[PDB]
Symmetry: C4
Subunit: 460 residues, 4 copies
């Protein structure tokens, strides 16, 4: 009565087909889903690459146009050190903004007004921020500071020199910023056969004095707002149709998997009832179907967001990419289920499955030692070692060391400071050698031993 | 009747010699083949190195001569950013072309005419390509584009300034190219005792505006056409003879191996016929002889191509090198057969052979997870990480991570973008840590376990 | 009588609670200790990061202000090679010191007098050191040297050119130094909500001729003396209270652990006495409590030093950081004790414990081979290889090689010297290949085997 | 009669002492030998470091003084590309040579005459080498060359401009060289308390045109001839005594070890004779004593060479360093013998010993595959990949790949050439992926398996 039903429920697709001759719709549906999801992700990535490259190339051009004495690879060290240098950089940026139409290799339009920091009819805002009251007398070890920040900002209209009278309050200066906007048209879209779209680049140039260290870093950042151009004309819809096909495939997969999960739950309820006459009742849950339902939800939501983005109604590229990428990862991981139907592959998959619990437990054991080392290295070596400045950076360095990467440079950075502090150098020697020896000779060896033991258990 | 024949067929060379005292011609033939094939490959590579160096040195000299403000290591970032910069670069290249006889350290001759892009009597072609109709008004978010490309190209005759009147259509410009040819004689051939040959370098300088990003990259490429000089004269054939010797050795090896394979097939047919009174019948096939026949074919074809190339009748160096290198690899791999005749080496070789099937199956299992990670990383991190821009690049990065290479720089690239997008940085942390942990603690451990299990099976 | 007491003594916390229902104060005390110690370390590190950054940024600004022709990344090669270059560098540094008020982006005050090398009223000391008697005649292979060093030093008062008359004794010059001090106020302290403190930077510029090689390296170092500003005023104590809480928690932990250790010792004495009617009697010692007592002592001492430092009465940041970091590492390592109470985690921890003795013995065996290789590589390759200049550097290089890091660059450095000395290049080939092969194929394999054997022993 | 003698012969030092109470002179002699040999090596290395640094610093100073437009890190790319550049470089070098007394920071004396290439009274030789007859007409694809090299060389006397009339035969130029010598005194010897010695630097500047590629590399090399200064005088022998002590210790060790080996041989002869009433008779040979005798010979010879060198009668630093380093390596490896006397260490050492034969056999099996890959990669990728230019470089790259080092850069170098040749890029993908997969997943796994099997054999 019930034993036959339970036996059918826990049977492989091939033997299920032999038993009842039903159509294996779900399996071919999953194959088609993998295909279409991968194709959609590839097309989306190819489309996004072009936009990313356009933005990056424009920003590099802006750095070469507006930053005085800029060269590639200098982003992290580009700074001013004298009052003359700072004035020259600021005035050069403003003059290049005013000369852009006659000098630039790109074609840019000016944007006026549109809220702060710009007044009406103003294209460029040159704003200096300094403390409301600042009296600093290091000679007398004295200071009187009101930390309230005051902004004083000059407005420059593009053509068709009040900024040259700028006077900086160096002793109380917090920062200087230059804000402007440039409109351009992405013609290289025609390479991919699309229609050009209209970009507005919001450019911010920052001269940062918040450290008050005598060194003022200079940076240029851009933010791109993309719109559909309002008058396209190119001499002489199969992308939304594919998105709809993807949505329908994922919807059908979700419905079939949900029906299977519901049937499994009903059978579990029947079994518990008949056994009245949780690790065991959760044996009725097909984890692969949980994974498939999750991937279907992620794909549908990401495809809706993609439709929005490609129509220019949305600009949340990161979230859409994360959803689509995670769903593609899950659907490809789901291919392991088909390999589990064959004995030779199932041996290896079962080995991994039976090893996983002890691997996780050993990871928990190793984590406390690893975290102790992280904290110690951060506190002791952070003042001296560039790779130990932040806790996340320390963790990345230690993790790379565990895997035998970037070891000699880590030792050499401390070598460069051996003469300064001998105690810190000796401590670094002990710290690095002990950590590496412990984690390579003993920890990774035990991971290998756990996997080998699981494999030997499976093979018998 | 037949059992004796089958026993003789499946016997080692030494015991075969004991049984019938026949001459082991094939074994010494294989030894000689390995020797001569390796010698030929070494000579060919030594000869190709000189030509490669000559071409590379000439091209570096051209970059220093013709690119304004060029310096070594700037190939990937060399670009123009202003109209003045572009004009200066173009005019500098043309002026250096015209001044070459009096300034260059090399000796070059001019080439005139000879088809497009050059007219008759013209040495240098300066061509600008722009859209047929281009109206771009980013101010009004408007554009009218006919994507048909128009080429307008100026011709410069070498001496024995109409180009100075060039006017670039910056808004519709697709690219600018400079084409010319230089003839030189490779005298350093005398270092290797050969006869100098005549090179024609086709030089192409590209100013690329296809991105329309305000940044125009500049590159110089060369193509070398090598000929026999028509009037050699050096004050005061044992290379083709060696090629013929190689061809004959490989032909004899091919014939002997083919005869052995035919005999094996005949014996298999006899055995099946007698067993009437495919994994078993393919046991009659000597795989080492399949490999030897393949290597003989590859060596003969590559040697024919090499004879053609060295006479200057062919220029397909890549295919010839691939054929000869693959054949040399195969003949060296064939030395394992001789080690299989000794018990202690055969133990290890048999271990590898019995492990291989499960290793391939586990590779198949690991491949789907790896590919899912590839797709996810490409879509999510490609906009932010230089190592994740293309799918092949993503695969290379992930493969290097599996083996503990370039890990910290991968983490640091994302560190550099933590402030921008926190969600993407957190995702990258999860992505990298999970991938590395999974593939190093569990996957490589299982490869080790598979090999160890195979070894323990062999030793019992 | 006694067996019950001994059984209670060697019981887990849960079963102890069942037996006597006593309060598990020590366990929750240890949890609280871990929490507060970690919080204190994080706060201390965040506070120290700001000061480190302030000092580093000021020093970089000084290098750009005072070193003629300095650029970032040139610290290790910055040098003078002509007499004119050296004079220009010295005079540029002094002129920039005199012009600092009108050119610097920072706000600095001059410091006068205050002991050597400065006289009263002098801000900058320009001192040249040369041998008392030096006659060097390489033409006649002759020299007469009195190695006693003479110091002649010019004093410059800051404003509100006797140094321009400096004449260097080039042939007998030992070095040149420029000493001065600058007072500044650390305003960026307000970012962390603290009160700005007063920094005195002692700047030393060295032109070093001790090698007498014709190349004089130039360096700039700073030493920061931090004080409480004597007239703070910022428009509109929960850090010392936390330190006191930490001290009290660690004191209570120390007392409870000491009481437990004393009770264990008394029980051991009773057991030996009753067994009259050291590896066994030390079984009565709880090693986790030894570790906890050590961590308590380190935390208390480090917290006292931290209280001193934050009040500006102490400047021993290195020792305080080492104490606090080591204590945090120990308290996090102590979490393993709680995992040992659960069978599945205890299996892995016990595996590590039983493997440790043989791991240490094998480390001892490997150490002599490693040290022999260190000495050989230092003596043979040190003259030619940058990574082999010092013994500690050699050890770092070899250790990185063992773990598969920085291998190809090590080979390439010797490749760059193959033409010079063929014998040394061949020796380096043998040396590197043999070391790497031995230590990767055999040594690490044996570490894996030891751990696997221990794991198999534990699982049975 | 004999069994007692054989039993005594094969006994440990402790049990030997119990049996006969003889003095263990050899063991303490070996301890003293290790100590003194290590001390000698350390002192020798510290002494050599100073001389190496002096030579390197002088050579860097020469590069900055004599090479026009030279900067650090440009050694490998420093070249001339125009006739004007080459003339300027040559004339700048000669002018700096003539101005050296008034410009250099070092103190140098001129050397005149003394054989070729200098005439009597000449300090600098400026020599150009070109073909005897050279007619190159690339326009007509014609050339008439007599490869005999003619040298024409101008002589410059130092002061107390015929070279300015140099005319270069650019079309037939082989190279240009500048030779001169400078005498200096190594004053920094006083830092180590030694006596300054007199250096003669032979400086060679080469402008190399042997490629005839239009790019002429420029290099500067030095050769240092060190002498004892003939008139030392420093205001106000325990190194040779230590060398004699080392020689005597090694002589005594050699004699005792030779006596033991002779006794072993005599006992073996007795045993074979009595067994009449080679793997077994070589069991009578103590391999540790063979090693000790070798190390004694190497140490004595190296110490003799060191005595010669330090007296300035010899200049063979490389051979002496190799001898002393190898001997120190051997004496430190000999410490394993003492660990073999203890069971727990002997287990691990015996594991390594019993694994070694199969490890060597597997290395032999792996070598043919590795060499096939080396040849294939050299021939196919050498034209395109910098890491594959020479066979030794290919081997170093592949060995580094086996150990997971420098993998991503190897892939990226080929990425940079994907557009050029797609066939070569695909081949490189297959080549690299297959090599790395094979050698990491299967070969290293089998090394681990061999060691684990040996360990399990030893433990039972
Ligand atoms: C009255 C119906 C009410 C429910 C409505 C929804 C019905 C619906 O989704 O059925 C899914 C199946 C295929 O679903 P599919 O997954 O291909 O097949 C099922 C699975 O193999 C399942 O095993 P697991 O996958 O391991 O859980 C098994 O237990 C079911 O048998 P069982 O029923 O005897 O237990 C199968 O029917 O059938 C269609 O797909 C109908 C196509 C119709 C024509 C389409 C247009 C031409
Ligand atoms: C009538 C003949 C028609 C066929 C013509 C071609 C004949 C031809 O290739 O024979 C190859 C053998 C050597 O060939 P070689 O490979 O050295 O030797 C054979 C292999 O050992 C083979 O074993 P596998 O290699 O394991 O398959 C074995 O079965 C054969 O014995 P079997 O015949 O009893 O079965 C051997 O003869 O003999 C010559 O090489 C003759 C030299 C002649 C003189 C050369 C100039 C001085
Ligand atoms: C007359 C007393 C003289 C000694 C004075 C110091 C007394 C002192 O430290 O006791 C520690 C314990 C808790 O200490 P705590 O560590 O939580 O608990 C002890 C441990 O569990 C110990 O095992 P191990 O940790 O494995 O060694 C066990 O043997 C002891 O039982 P036993 O005594 O039967 O052998 C327990 O009492 O009790 C308080 O903490 C009192 C709180 C009082 C109220 C506080 C304010 C509200
Ligand atoms: C008539 C003698 C002719 C031969 C002359 C040379 C004699 C010479 O080298 O003896 C070495 C031994 C110490 O040598 P040493 O190595 O310390 O000791 C020997 C080893 O232990 C050897 O074992 P292995 O090392 O395993 O082979 C063992 O067989 C010998 O016993 P056996 O003789 O019963 O077989 C020992 O004598 O004795 C001195 O060192 C004498 C010191 C004298 C005083 C020095 C100044 C105060
Ligand atoms: C039948 C249930 C077994 C678990 C399948 C889900 C595995 C997901 C891997 C991420
Ligand atoms: C006797 C047949 C066994 C297989 C030999 C071929 C192996 C080729 C390795 C690439």
């Amino acid at each position: 009565d019930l034993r036959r039903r339970l036996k059918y429920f826990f049977m492989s697709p091939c033997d299920k087909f032999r038993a009842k001759g039903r159509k294996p719709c779900k399996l071919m549906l999953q194959v088609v889903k993998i295909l279409v999801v991968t194709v959609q992700l590839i097309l989306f990535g190819l489309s996004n690459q072009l936009a990313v490259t356009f933005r990056e190339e424009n920003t590099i051009a802006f750095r070469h146009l507006f930053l005085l004495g800029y060269s590639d690879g200098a982003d992290d060290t580009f700074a001013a050190y004298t009052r003359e240098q700072l004035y020259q950089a600021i005035f050069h940026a403003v003059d290049q903004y005013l000369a852009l139409p006659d000098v630039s290799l790109g074609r840019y339009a000016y944007v006026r007004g549109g809220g702060d920091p710009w007044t009406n009819g103003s294209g460029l805002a040159l704003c200096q921020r300094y403390y409301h009251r600042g009296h600093v007398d290091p000679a007398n070890d004295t200071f009187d500071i009101d930390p309230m920040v005051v902004t004083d900002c000059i407005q420059v209209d593009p053509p068709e020199s009040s900024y040259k009278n700028l006077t900086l309050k160096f002793h109380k200066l917090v920062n200087v910023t230059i804000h402007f906007r440039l409109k351009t048209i992405n013609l290289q879209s025609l390479i991919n056969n699309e229609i050009p779209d209209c970009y507005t680049f919001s450019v911010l140039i920052t001269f940062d004095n918040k450290a008050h260290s005598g060194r003022i870093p200079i940076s240029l950042e851009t933010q791109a707002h993309i719109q559909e151009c309002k008058h396209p004309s190119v001499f002489q819809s199969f992308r939304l149709l594919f998105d709809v096909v993807v949505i329908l495939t994922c919807s059908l997969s979700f419905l079939l998997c949900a029906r299977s999960l519901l049937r499994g739950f009903l059978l579990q309820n029947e079994f518990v009832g008949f056994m009245w006459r949780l690790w065991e009742r959760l044996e009725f849950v097909n984890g692969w179907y949980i994974l498939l339902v999750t991937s279907d939800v992620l794909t549908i939501s990401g495809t809706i967001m993609k439709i929005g983005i490609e129509a220019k109604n949305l600009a949340s590229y990161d979230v859409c990419s994360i959803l689509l990428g995670t769903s593609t990862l899950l659907v490809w991981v789901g291919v392991i289920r088909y390999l589990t139907f064959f004995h030779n592959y199932n041996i290896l998959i079962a080995t991994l499955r039976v090893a996983l619990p002890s691997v996780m437990r050993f990871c928990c054991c190793v984590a406390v030692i690893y975290l102790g080392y992280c904290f110690c290295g951060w506190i002791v070596l952070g003042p001296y070692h560039v790779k130990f400045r932040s806790l996340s950076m320390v963790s990345e360095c230690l993790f790379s060391l565990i895997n035998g990467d970037d070891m000699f440079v880590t030792f050499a950075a401390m070598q460069a400071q051996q003469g300064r502090s001998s105690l810190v150098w000796l401590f670094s020697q002990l710290y690095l050698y002990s950590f590496i020896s412990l984690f390579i000779y003993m920890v990774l060896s035990l991971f290998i031993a756990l996997i080998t033991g699981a494999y030997d258990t499976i093979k018998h």
